[PDB]
Amino acid sequence: ARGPKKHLKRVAAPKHWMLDKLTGVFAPRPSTGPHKLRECLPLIIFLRNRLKYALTGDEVKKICMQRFIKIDGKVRTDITYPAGFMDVISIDKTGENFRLIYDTKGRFAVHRITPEEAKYKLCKVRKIFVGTKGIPHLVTHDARTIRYPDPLIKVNDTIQIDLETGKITDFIKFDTGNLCMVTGGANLGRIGVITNRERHPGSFDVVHVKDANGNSFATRLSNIFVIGKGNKPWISLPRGKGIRLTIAEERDKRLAAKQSSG
């Protein structure tokens, strides 16, 4: 190419958007924004493919252009605006609030939350620097910078934002015994307790996580998001509790849902 690309073919779109083959050649191609385009939901896919409020992209244009969608407390008229992990999508007209949280199969769930919960979110601090007359700074996982954080906040911690002010209320430290969600790789969407972290210098660290049923899995350090302190999550968790069932017991649950219902 002679410059940056603007299209996305539909087959090369991310798998967890769950687009299908035959409706078009192109995928929505997210705008640049706070989240990575392999790691986001564009607002057009959330609003007609997940919520079924629209049937075309033209109707998503009509819904968004009435200024009806607030993502993290601000109105977005962009239909390909990249919403991402733990963003609060709040539709005021229908009185719904949503948070984007991965399912146990690594896709964003349609997780409804109460408007008490819709005033905060958790972020993961990715960078700390001191800049220009000794003012300390944060950089979170969704491109927020915060001036003057608490000096105990370090890289890989998890802070809590109030969505109106933008300021930190409190935070969790990165330690063994805290609760996780995996935000990357094979183990994506799983939830458990930190038990170990082995440090390889010059390369990626590996964190071992233990499930609520005693299953254990590793990730890398960058695929780790500290949800809660100890065992209590600071947010509401989706339908499955981050416990990935095997295919045999998922089949057993799906068959037990048919011999009882009907």
Partner: peptide, 30 residues
């Protein structure tokens, strides 16, 4: 905005200074 955040940090910096300064001399005599 700038004057309020600079004061609120310096008020918060005193606690994180003196909590470390408590355990500074705590380990030495022990």
């Amino acid at each position: 905005k700038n004057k309020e955040e600079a004061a609120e940090y310096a008020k918060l910096l005193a606690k994180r200074m003196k909590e470390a300064k408590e355990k500074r001399q705590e380990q030495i005599a022990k």
